[PDB]
Ligand binder design. Sequence first.
Ligand SMILES: OC[C@H]1O[C@H](OC[C@H]2O[C@H](O)[C@H](O)[C@@H](O)[C@@H]2O)[C@H](O)[C@@H](O)[C@@H]1O
Ligand SMILES: *[C@@H]1O[C@H](CO[C@H]2O[C@H](CO)[C@@H](O)[C@H](O)[C@H]2O)[C@@H](O)[C@H](O)[C@H]1O
Ligand SMILES: [Ca+2]
Ligand SMILES: [Ca+2]
Ligand SMILES: [Ca+2]
Ligand SMILES: [Ca+2]
Ligand SMILES: [Ca+2]
Ligand SMILES: [Ca+2]
Ligand SMILES: [Ca+2]
Ligand SMILES: [Ca+2]
Length: 729
Amino acid sequence: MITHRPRGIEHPYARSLDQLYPAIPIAGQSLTIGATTSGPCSRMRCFVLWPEHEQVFDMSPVNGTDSDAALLAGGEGHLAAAQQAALDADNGWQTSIPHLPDQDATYYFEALTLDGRTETSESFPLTPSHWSAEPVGHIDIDGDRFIPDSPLWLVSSAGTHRVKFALRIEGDEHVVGFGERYDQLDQRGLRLDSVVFEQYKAQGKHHRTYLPMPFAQVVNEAGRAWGFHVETTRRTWYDVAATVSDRILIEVDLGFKTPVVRVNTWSGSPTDVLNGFLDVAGRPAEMPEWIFGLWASGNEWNTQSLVMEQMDRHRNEGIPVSVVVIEAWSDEEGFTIFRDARYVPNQGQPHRGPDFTYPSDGAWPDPAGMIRELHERGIRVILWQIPLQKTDDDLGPEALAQGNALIASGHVVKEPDGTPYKNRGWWFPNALMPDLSTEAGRQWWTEQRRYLVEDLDIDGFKTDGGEHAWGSDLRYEDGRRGDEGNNLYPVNYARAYGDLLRSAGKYPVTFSRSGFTGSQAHGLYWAGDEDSTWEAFRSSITAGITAGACGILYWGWDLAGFSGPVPEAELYARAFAAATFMPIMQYHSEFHHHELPLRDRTPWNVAEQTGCGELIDLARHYTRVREALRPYLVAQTRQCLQTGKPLMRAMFYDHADDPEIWAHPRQYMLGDELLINPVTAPGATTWTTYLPEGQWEDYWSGEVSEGGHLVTRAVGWDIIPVYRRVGAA
Ligand SMILES: OC[C@H]1O[C@H](OC[C@H]2O[C@H](O)[C@H](O)[C@@H](O)[C@@H]2O)[C@H](O)[C@@H](O)[C@@H]1O
Ligand SMILES: *[C@@H]1O[C@H](CO[C@H]2O[C@H](CO)[C@@H](O)[C@H](O)[C@H]2O)[C@@H](O)[C@H](O)[C@H]1O
Ligand SMILES: [Ca+2]
Ligand SMILES: [Ca+2]
Ligand SMILES: [Ca+2]
Ligand SMILES: [Ca+2]
Ligand SMILES: [Ca+2]
Ligand SMILES: [Ca+2]
Ligand SMILES: [Ca+2]
Ligand SMILES: [Ca+2]
C-alpha cells in the first residue's frame, strides 16, 4: 500500500516522508513530493495531470533528513548513539518540481513491488497558491502602527490559506511577550512562532515553548508602551524586525469564508497594555496561601512508604514543605486508581472511594490515611494526570473498559473520518485524547477522578502534557477543527480540572506546563523539562519573567533541573536561593527506572551524591527565608490581581523610563519592593546588580545604596543579591 498525506504527520517543526513540502504549495517555488510504501518496492512514479499537459516523475528512495528523523523521535534530548533504535520500517520515495506552475492539477502514485504487483494510490488535488495584495480579506485593527498597504493574502482556487501584514516599530523599542520564552527577554531581532509544542529540554537553544501566546508588548525608552494580540488560536509567526529592521512582520494561519483577522491593540503605561490583554484573555484566580511554601516532588516516590519517608525527613531536618506532588501513584494504565488497589470491575463507569480495598502489603495500603496525616502536618497533596487514555494491547480489563467507555461516550478528539484520534507523538504513542472542548466532555473525563477529591481529599492536580494533538483537520465537539482546537487544548484541559476542584469545594490548584491565551485564568504553571545545567538555570529565569509579562502569575520551575545525575553542589545552592524568590518554589526529579544512584533533588540526596554536606544547612536557611516571605508573597499577589502586574516582574513595568534596565535582563522585581539578581555563573565570589533610581536596602546586611548605579555584592552561597526599596520613615 502507498501512503501519501499532503500535510504529513503534522509535527509543527518536522516533515514526514509521505507529504508535500511546502504543505500548501506555492506557485513559482519548488515543491517536494513524498510518498511511502508499506512493503519494499523497485520503482515509484508520480503522475501529475495538468490541464493541457501530463508529466511523470521517477521518484528516488530517500531517508529522512538528520533534523526531521530526530524531531519525529522527540528531538535531540531523546537521542544518543548509545541507544540505537531500529531502522525506519517505512520506505520513503521522493521527487520534486523546481518551479511549480500556477495551474491546478491532480496527481497520483504508482509503485512496482518486489514481487511484481502494481500499486496505485488515490488521486490528490494540487492547487498552487500565490500572494495577493488584492483586498481578499480585512485586518480589523485600530491604533497607529499598522502599515495599511502591508496585507498579503495567500490564495488558491480552493480559498485563502494565510495572511501576512506588518506593524511599525521605532528605534528605541523593545518587544517582550509571545508567552513563556526561554532564549531572551527582548525578542527584537528574532524570528519565532506561537504553536503549542513539547520541546523536551533545551527550549531556549531551540527557540520553542510549551506556552506560547500571539501577543506582545512594545516598550520605548521614555516609558511608554503599546501592544498587540492577534485574536486567534491558529498558528502565528513573527519576524520581529529581523528582516526589515523597523517592521514586525506577522503571518497568520487562516481557516479550512471571507477572512477577517482581528488584532487587539492598546497603549499607555506597560501595565495599561498588559491589563488590556488580560481583559481579553482572562485574569489570574485567587489562590490559597499554602501554594507559597516549598513543593516537594520526585517521580520515584512510587509507594506510600517512599512518600512518607521523605515527608518525615523534611520534618526531622527542619525544612518544612507545604505541598507534596505524587506522580507515580496509579496503576500506570488508567491514571484513575492507586497502584495495587482491589475493586469490582465497572464497565468503565466512575468509581467511588468505597469501591476500593487496599492490600496491607501493596504500594498504597491506606492512601486516605496518608492524605489525612499529611493534612494534619499542614502538607497538601497533588496527583499527576495526563490528558490521554492508553490503548496498549497489554492493558488490564479495567483500563480497556475505561477506553471503550471514553470512545463510546463520543467525548474523544476525532480524525476527519470520525474515528478516534490516535496520538501521533512519541510519548504515550497511539493513545486516545479526550475531547475537553465542551462542558459535557470535560465533565465525563473529570467525573472518573471525582472520588480522588471528594472521598480521598486530595488538593489538586499536576496536569502534565496537553501538547499531543497534531492535525489541522481533527474534529472537536465544540465545532472547531484542529487548526484552532489543538493550541486551545491545554487551556480546556487545565480548566476541566480546575472546575472539578471548584465543584468539590476546593481551590482550583492545577499545575501545568502547557498553555495558550486564556491559561492566565487556570491555576499554576512550571517551566517544564530541563537538564541540571547553568544554561538551563538562566533559561528558566527568562521563562518566568516572560511568562509573567503575559499574565502567567503563579509560575515556577524544577529548581536546578530534574533530568540526569543530580546537579553539582554549587548549582543546587544558587538555584535553591533563586527559587526562594520566585512565585512557586519546587524541587523535582525525573524517572530513572529506580536505578542507582538515587536521583532525587532533595537537599539530603544532593548533599550525599555531591559530598557537600552544607547543602542541608543551606536548604534550612533558604526555607526559613521562604517561610518569612510568605506574608509578602500573599500580599503582593493580592495586589497583582488588582493592578494586573506580574509577581515575577520584568524591570520595565516599574522602571521603563530608564534605558539601562535592558542591559540586565535576568534581574527582576518580586512584587513592588524586592529587586532580585540570581547568581548564574560557577565560581562567582561577587555579583553586580543595576539599581534603578531611589534608595535600596540590602536584604541581608541592611546596607543602603543610592539608585541609578551598578553595585557589587560579595556572594557566598548563603547570599543571593536582593535589594528592598527604602520606604518613607
Ligand atoms: O518527551 C516526552 C517525555 O519524556 C520524558 O519521559 C520519558 C523518558 O524520557 C527519556 O527516556 C528519559 O531518559 C527518561 O528518564 C524518561 O522517563 C519526560 O520525563 C517527560 O516529562 C516528557 O513528557
Ligand atoms: C511530565 O512527565 C513526567 C512524568 O512522567 C513519568 O511518570 C508518569 C507517572 O508515573 C509515567 O506514566 C510516565 O510514563 C513517565 O514518563 C514528569 O516527571 C515531568 O515533570 C513532566 O514534564
Ligand atoms: Ca543526528
Ligand atoms: Ca542527544
Ligand atoms: Ca507487470
Ligand atoms: Ca492591499
Ligand atoms: Ca488553517
Ligand atoms: Ca462498582
Ligand atoms: Ca504488546
Ligand atoms: Ca543531562
